[PDB]
Design a protein around this ligand. Structure first.
Ligand code: ATP
Ligand code: ADP
Ligand code: ADP
Ligand code: MG
Ligand code: MG
Lengths: 339, 46, 517, 464, 467, 50
């Protein structure tokens, strides 16, 4: 009986082996067939349209992190103060204020002792404020003094959070002046393009991220190497130069991506890094933005990342959540789903 | 006896498995076309 | 003969229904990996113990949830993990398929067959962490689980729903005892009545693959493989599988137990699971305690072993009996893990190397082996005949120092010594030879009624066996009576005595001495 | 004001609260696991204030299925258990939830399980003896009222019957109640105890609190405190004498060690928690006599590796007032309760406490029994006839004494129809004085099994 | 796309790579040391992905003279070693470089030293005695052809001598290929084994792979994998019975521990790495026979401080089909081989395989020796005269049995000048049956010490004036 | 390559050098001796252990 059972087991082992071989060759031929069919751009457009239709039927969902409670609350207070200041300050004063805040932040980063004294949590605000005037009461304008006094009058879990908050305020001021100019979309696009190229050129990002070297040399390199070109927004270049100058222990391309994310968040949008297999159409782009906004509610700014391996569909990723309509992903699923 | 039956069955089933592999090489086109149609979401004749 | 119709049928069915529509997936990224642990940033909504899919079909378990990342235990092929890989959350805690189709199959802790015998049809799925039956969902343990070993069945009886630890040094016969129990369940299986049948689960944790193959071969020889399932976590498996294997076996057994079936589950052995869990915990940087174990190793084993229970008749009356194995070093039962498991379980069978070498096989130390369930796990005949064994053996062990001075011993004490010698020889049992409960009852009746007093020690074993043959050959009605009434009636007792006396007239001792009267 | 989960590491959960809403140490917080298979409400006991509005908590239930960021609610008080007469006849867990009838006791008054011992000035300075009514305990190992008694016994020596007997006697004579605390309780044995107490009809006199094997260390650590809180209510509020059973106290110590390890504390000698003595004191110091009422505790003690110098038993024995050994030999001899009269001991068997006559009779009984124990081996191997005439006279007297140490227990009524007996202490003293003087040697041994005082002895003698 | 050295701490090196260029786990990287005295090319094995494009690696050679920031080149694969029939008769190191003839084997096929074990369905239990000619081994722990054999023992109890004896008795006339793996043992012993195999004409069938105790932890970790890869090629590809000798496998474990704490993982009990059992399981499970493909593997397992409860030997025990436990107590008595009969074991010592007479005689010998061990302390204190007559007979019989279990081994002549002897299994069974029956109780016990069969016993007894 | 175990108990008994014969050993053996010494002292260590 066990011998006959062994015969049957070996028979169906062979059957499973043959099924696996047939499935493998069939999926390989299907991959070749889809590769041949997808060459036509009309096929690209049809696949993207079908994925958009599928998304439109998708039921809407509902759902810096590294800051702890005290640092996050103090940053919230600082941004609250900054908005009120900037509203009256207006664009030119915003330029001056951003430069002054960046200089103050790099000074704080340099003088570790001063940073520690201004960062240690304390009950009262009179001593810290008093020292702030005693240091730079008249050197910089009143707006910067008020913002710095508010920044140091609050509590921070770690001292580095203070420098981070000041840098954030300076970035916010630059973004606010950009908004006043009304070319916010231009700076968004420039920042995202710079992030993409820095990521694609890790050597340059590593060279910039070496904060041991003087800031002036790094910013000069950036000006005369990458960000200084006829087709560059002035405000985006200023933001990139500011972040690199103040950079310390942070990935450069990651810093640029953070600038872009903050810039889009200024108006409340959500950045959706849509990676399509080909350049999209205006109608398709608008339809995609609308459907993503409906799914996630909040307005969505879509950044396109073309790539051939996708073969179709859109591999959307927003807010740590991915909708993978890629045709290549479908091929992988077909191959791996076999018995 | 179990061992000799096992080996003779092994050789015969290997032979007929090669034969069935030869036989099933034909219908691969249809199955691959069906799979491609399903993944693409639109039927493709090729 | 392999038909080509099914070959095409399977693939055409698969492709025709290859619906791979898109869906929203929470993603994370591997930020570091090492030694079978991967830390994954992202996955904000992942649950503790959630299964995670890494690229290439790799699986992990989310164990450490932090504000920075998730430390996950990779369940296999850890070398494929790389920094930057995308990790998906399945949305499920660990679960295994369960069903009657798992009988006769060898699977890994995820339920995937490894015997190469094809697919296993799952009746349903069951989470590994489903809570144990509550204190009010049980009833008293009152049904014997016959191991077929006279030593256990008489001295440390095991009832259905009990957790009896098998603890001893290496090569003392622990696996032999467990496999003997599994084989002894064959007659109950053949009965066909589920109220008598026992499904068996054998969890092999950390054993080398050829050892598991040897155990499976032994089970095949005895026909036990029709009602046995083997969950294999060989030594080459990731620490995650070694840590999960007992829980997989327990989940399968629980599926059977909650449907009114009776299950015997063997864990061979829990010490290796504890070692694997300690490895995982240390690699996760969890605080170590005594012997470097984490603070919840006792919880590990206690939650595992409390799922073996005798359910109340409202829930179906099914049961699961646990036979955890613990390997001690230098006979140190006061080590951390032996102490924990001894505390957790109902009774202990202590196997000793010195007894094994002395010829006492199975090498169970009846002096220290205990069964808190006791007589409730014995049939009436067994309880009656075995009543005097404990005191007889204790007195014999006390008197063993006076072996050579029998002239100075009073008549009673020399009788005690001789009876104890015969009884020790009685409890010996060859490997892979379980005895039916009626056979054990008759053998113990021989020992404790003084019918062995006229036989030399060196012949007792042989005598016993031959007598058991003789009865089964010509006086099977005694075995019937015992089995179908669970008691030794007076008429049966007298008939058995006459049969014993006739056999003694027939018996030939090794040295030619007459064993008559 | 509600917090949210930040870190989950096994039973340890870190929770972040708003700036000024951090729970007090030992507060109970409630979280929710919504995953269907494992859906439950987690009770988290606050263990440490990590700073920056984070608290480290021990989960009382397994954290499998718990998600980061889920809301954590503060109850504003530590673990509280229901108190009052309504808890008797019911089974609760360390958290106060009723097991035999979920939802029961939710409207009862609830007391925090973390309470201080009676004020030093409120302690009854003078030790007092607990007149159980059992000859062996009253004479040889008297129990201290408001004291602690270690109980030692293997399987099948009548330990459960002795617990039933103590419940019966405390309920009947003293008009008291009983709280059983199963620390590290096996679920099978918990169910068995529940059913057996129901069968004996003493479940109505007892409140059962089970922290089981398969629960995380926190509940096994706190179940003794929960049962102690119920007993403290019975003593201080109902003005009753309470008998608290703890089984096993060593498992309370081991759960404390496990929790300490989980919280990152460095182990002290032999791997135990650094605060082992402090934890044991916080527990055992609440079991005392105050305001004329008392909690007396009988505790099962496990000794690791039989090493009485091991830190856990060494710490526990600092608080124990008496010890009662249950011997399989005595049980096999049919003597009930199977108390080993020689190994069992009491710290108040002292002329200062029990008086001169009691002490003298006890010492004489101990001497006779000890010398009979010495003769045991000679009698067994060489036979009784080998003994001298004085030796045989002493053997007869000692056998009679050890048989008279047996008694017909109230709990024994269910098994054997004969009802139990209570022997007044003075009657026991005079009876054993007579026995040690040989004033009963002429009577047969059988007259001395499972009887009460001298009246019962005589009456059974005329029955032979 | 090349990495750079960031941190150097002993045998562990941290390397930073450009994002997207991080080597896979167990990849082999190359770094240059250009200091004139110690100039070399370090091979680094990627052990961990530390994050931020940093990888922690184990160096296979001493890192002396290495400089932070130097270029690290990723080979894209794991450490690979030559495989084929050409490796026979040559000595390789853990990295696959031939030592006797440098440059040899570089054109061969190369196999990665990291491999998965055979599938469970392919495993077949092995039960076939491998007669050796040693009385104690053949009687009480019979070896399994195609099975796993270990020699446990403390330091300097006779593990290496017994390995050489088995090479003389098993590998000399073995049909197939032999692979010897020196794992963290003495270089002098490796040279001696090389010369001995060459002089015995066995080298041409043997592949030697050496990583000595003087090498860094990484080499001692991976030499076993390299030798096992060679053996696996012979088993799976060439299809011939393989003899695999490993000495000492414990070193593998030790090597891992030496680096474990430098790799950032908290120590386990007794200072071992937490991954002790898992690494050991991977390695051991790779060493096995599969259905129709035989590897007879014999491993010497060091037992630290003579402690058999140590985690390393305790974990190794589970992986063996037969174990010969060498004891310091037996060694100190002058009994050689210093086998502890009461502790050694074999899975084929049962009546089904070895037969009823062999099993009966072995059980009787074990029972007698156990009783002798039990009575030894009584004899030490109270003296032998206070025993019963049967106990006195048993003591005499047991002393003679334990003497007769000793044997003059072929490999031991260097230590005694006495040529070795070989005893057939049937003669061993008959002789020990006679001993247990008391047939030789009259001969002096010294007549049983370090001899061969019964003829040698008679001759030695005659030499002592007894018959 | 072997060891010479020295014991204080042997030293006090007068065994100087206090070499513990049973556990002391050389892993080279007769190869490290001249022919005459190897002949006379072939099995001296085993003799003394016994
Ligand atoms: N009753 C018995 N009679 C004779 N031999 C037996 C008996 N039980 C076990 N043995 C033998 O004892 C040896 C050890 O048995 P077994 O493998 O079951 O023990 P173990 O404690 O599980 O061992 P390990 O530590 O290897 O897992 C084997 O040779 C087995 O055949
Ligand atoms: N005084 C007594 N009278 C009658 N029966 C008793 C007495 N004491 C004990 N027994 C019997 O002995 C058994 C002892 O078991 P148990 O009470 O559970 O003690 P343990 O918990 O130590 O095993 C009980 O089942 C009971 O029936
Ligand atoms: N069979 C034997 N006969 C005589 N001496 C031996 C024998 N085996 C070992 N020895 C002695 O014991 C020493 C230790 O043996 P060896 O195997 O080299 O060490 P280890 O046990 O550490 O491998 C040897 O160098 C030798 O001197
Ligand atoms: Mg085993
Ligand atoms: Mg050696």
């Amino acid at each position: 009986a066990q011998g006959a059972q062994q015969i049957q087991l070996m028979r169906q082992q062979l059957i499973r082996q043959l099924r696996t071989g047939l499935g493998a060759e069939a999926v390989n031929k299907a991959a070749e067939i889809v590769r041949a069919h997808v060459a036509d751009p009309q096929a690209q457009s049809a696949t993207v349209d079908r994925f958009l239709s599928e998304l439109e039927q998708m039921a809407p969902s509902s759902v810096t992190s590294r800051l702890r409670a005290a640092s996050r609350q103090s940053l919230a207070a600082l941004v609250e103060k900054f908005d009120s200041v900037a509203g009256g300050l207006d664009a030119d004063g915003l330029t001056n204020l951003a430069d002054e805040l960046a200089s103050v932040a790099k000074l704080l980063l340099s003088e570790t002792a001063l940073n520690k004294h201004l960062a240690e949590p304390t009950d009262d605000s009179a001593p810290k404020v008093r020292l702030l005037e005693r240091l730079l009461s008249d050197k910089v304008s009143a707006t910067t003094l008020d913002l710095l006094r508010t920044a140091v009058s609050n509590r921070w879990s770690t001292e580095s959070n203070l420098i981070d908050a000041v840098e954030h305020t300076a970035r916010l001021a630059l973004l606010k002046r950009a908004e006043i100019a009304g070319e916010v979309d231009e700076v968004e696009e420039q920042l995202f393009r710079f992030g993409r190229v820095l990521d694609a050129e890790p050597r340059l990002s590593a060279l910039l991220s070496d904060y041991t070297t003087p800031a002036e040399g790094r910013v000069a390199l950036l000006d005369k190497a990458l960000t200084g070109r006829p087709g560059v927004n002035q405000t985006a270049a200023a933001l990139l130069s500011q972040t690199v100058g103040l950079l310390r222990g942070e990935r450069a391309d990651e810093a640029v991506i953070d600038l872009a994310e903050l810039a889009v968040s200024r108006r409340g949008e959500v950045v959706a890094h849509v990676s399509a297999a080909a350049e999209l159409s205006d109608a398709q782009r608008t339809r995609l933005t609308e459907v993503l906004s409906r799914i996630y509610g909040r307005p969505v700014s879509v950044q396109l990342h073309v790539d051939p391996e996708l073969l179709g569909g859109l591999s959307i990723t927003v807010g740590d959540e991915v909708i993978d309509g890629s045709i290549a992903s479908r091929l992988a699923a077909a191959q791996t789903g076999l018995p | 006896e179990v061992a000799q039956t096992l080996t003779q069955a092994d050789q015969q089933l290997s032979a007929q498995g090669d034969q069935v592999r030869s036989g099933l090489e034909s219908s691969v086109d249809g199955l691959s076309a069906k799979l491609a149609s399903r993944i693409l979401g639109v039927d493709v004749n090729s | 003969t392999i038909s080509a119709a099914d070959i095409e049928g399977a693939i055409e069915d698969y492709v025709s229904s290859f619906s791979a529509d898109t869906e929203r997936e929470e993603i994370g990224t591997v930020i570091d990996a090492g030694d079978g642990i991967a830390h994954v940033e992202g996955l904000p909504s992942v649950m503790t113990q959630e299964l995670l899919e890494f690229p290439g079909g790799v699986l992990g378990v989310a164990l450490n949830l932090d504000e920075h990342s998730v430390g996950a235990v990779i369940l296999g092929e850890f070398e494929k993990i790389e920094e930057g890989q995308q990790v998906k959350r399945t949305g499920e805690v660990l679960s295994v398929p369960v069903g009657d189709a798992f009988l006769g199959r060898v699977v890994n802790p995820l339920g995937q067959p490894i015997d190469g015998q094809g697919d296993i049809a799952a009746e349903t799925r069951r989470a590994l962490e489903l809570q144990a039956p509550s204190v009010v969902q049980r009833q008293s343990v009152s049904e014997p689980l016959q191991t077929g070993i006279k030593a256990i069945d008489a001295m440390t009886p095991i009832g259905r729903g009990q957790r009896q630890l098998i603890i001893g040094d290496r090569k003392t016969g622990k696996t032999a005892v467990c496999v003997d129990t599994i084989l002894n369940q064959r007659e109950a299986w053949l009965t066909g009545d589920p109220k008598q049948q026992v499904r068996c689960v054998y969890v092999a944790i950390g054993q080398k693959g050829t050892t598991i193959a040897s155990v499976k071969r032994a089970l095949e020889e005895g026909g036990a493989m029709e009602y046995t399932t083997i969950v294999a976590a060989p030594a080459s498996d990731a620490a995650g599988f070694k840590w999960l294997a007992p829980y997989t076996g327990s989940a399968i057994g629980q599926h059977w137990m909650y449907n009114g079936k009776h299950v015997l589950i063997v864990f061979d052995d829990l010490s290796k699971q504890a070692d694997a869990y300690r490895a995982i915990s240390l690699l996760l940087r969890r605080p170590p305690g005594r012997e470097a174990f984490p603070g919840d190793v006792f919880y590990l084993h206690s939650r595992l072993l409390e799922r073996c229970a005798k359910l109340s008749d409202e829930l179906g009356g099914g049961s699961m009996t646990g036979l955890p194995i613990i390997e001690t070093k230098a006979n140190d039962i006061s080590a951390f893990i032996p102490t924990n498991v001894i505390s957790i379980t109902d009774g202990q069978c202590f196997l000793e190397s010195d007894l094994f070498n002395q010829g006492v096989r199975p090498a169970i130390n009846v002096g220290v082996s205990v069964s808190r369930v006791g007589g409730a796990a014995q049939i009436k005949a067994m309880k009656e005949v075995a009543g005097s064994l404990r005191l007889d053996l204790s007195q014999y062990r006390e008197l063993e120092a006076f072996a050579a001075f029998a002239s100075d011993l009073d008549a009673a004490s020399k009788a005690q010594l001789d009876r104890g010698a015969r009884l020790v020889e009685l409890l010996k049992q060859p490997q892979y030879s379980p005895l039916a409960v009626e056979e054990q009852v008759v053998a113990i009746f021989l020992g404790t009624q003084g019918h062995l007093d006229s036989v030399p020690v060196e012949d007792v074993q042989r005598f016993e066996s031959e007598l058991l043959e003789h009865v089964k050959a010509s006086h099977s009605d005694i075995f019937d009576g015992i089995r179908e009434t669970k008691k030794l009636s007076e008429e049966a007792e007298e008939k058995l005595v006459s049969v014993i006396n006739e056999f003694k007239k027939g018996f030939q001792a090794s040295d030619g001495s007459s064993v008559v009267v | 004001t509600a917090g949210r989960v930040v870190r989950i590491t096994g039973p340890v959960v870190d929770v972040e609260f708003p700036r000024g809403s951090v729970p007090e140490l030992f507060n109970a917080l409630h979280a929710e696991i919504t995953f269907g298979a494992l859906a439950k409400t987690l009770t988290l006991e606050v263990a440490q204030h990590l700073g920056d509005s984070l608290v480290r908590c021990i989960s009382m239930q397994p954290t499998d299925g718990l998600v980061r960021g889920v809301e954590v609610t503060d109850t504003g008080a530590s673990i509280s258990v229901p108190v009052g007469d309504g808890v008797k006849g019911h089974v609760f867990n360390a958290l106060g939830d009723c097991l035999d009838d979920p939802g029961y006791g939710k409207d009862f008054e609830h007391w925090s399980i973390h309470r201080k011992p009676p004020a030093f000035s409120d302690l009854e300075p003078r030790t007092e003896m607990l007149e159980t009514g059992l000859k062996v305990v009253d004479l040889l190992t008297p129990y201290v009222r408001g004291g602690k008694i270690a109980l030692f016994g293997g399987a099948g020596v009548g330990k459960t019957v002795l617990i039933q007997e103590m419940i019966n006697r405390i309920a009947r004579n003293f008009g008291g109640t009983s709280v059983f605390a199963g620390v590290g309780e096996r679920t099978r044995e918990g169910n068995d105890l529940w059913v057996e107490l129901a069968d004996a009809n003493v479940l109505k006199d007892t409140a059962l609190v089970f922290g089981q094997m398969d629960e995380p260390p926190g509940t096994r650590m706190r179940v003794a405190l929960s049962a102690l809180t119920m007993a403290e209510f019975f003593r201080d509020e109902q003005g009753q004498d309470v008998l608290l059973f703890i089984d096993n106290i060593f498992r309370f110590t081991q759960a404390g060690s496990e929790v300490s390890t989980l919280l990152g504390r460095m182990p002290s000698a032999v791997g135990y928690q650094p605060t082992l003595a402090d934890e044991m004191g916080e527990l055992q110091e609440r079991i005392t006599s105050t305001r004329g009422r008392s909690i007396t505790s009988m505790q099962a003690v496990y000794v690791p590796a039989d090493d009485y110098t091991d830190p856990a038993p060494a710490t526990t024995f600092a608080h124990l007032d008496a010890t009662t050994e249950l011997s399989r030999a005595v049980f096999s001899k049919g003597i009930f309760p199977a108390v080993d009269p020689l190994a069992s001991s009491s710290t108040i068997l002292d002329p200062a406490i029990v008086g001169d006559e009691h002490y003298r009779v006890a010492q004489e009984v101990i001497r006779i029994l000890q010398r009979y124990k010495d003769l045991q081996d000679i009698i067994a191997i060489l036979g009784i006839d080998e003994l001298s005439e004085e030796d045989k006279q002493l053997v007869n007297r000692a056998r009679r004494i050890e048989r008279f140490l047996s008694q017909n227990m109230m709990a024994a009524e269910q098994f054997t129809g004969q009802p139990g007996s209570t022997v007044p202490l003075k009657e026991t003293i005079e009876a054993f004085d007579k026995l040690t003087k040989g004033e009963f040697d002429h009577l047969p041994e059988q007259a001395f099994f499972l009887i009460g005082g001298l009246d019962d002895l005589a009456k059974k003698a005329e029955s032979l």
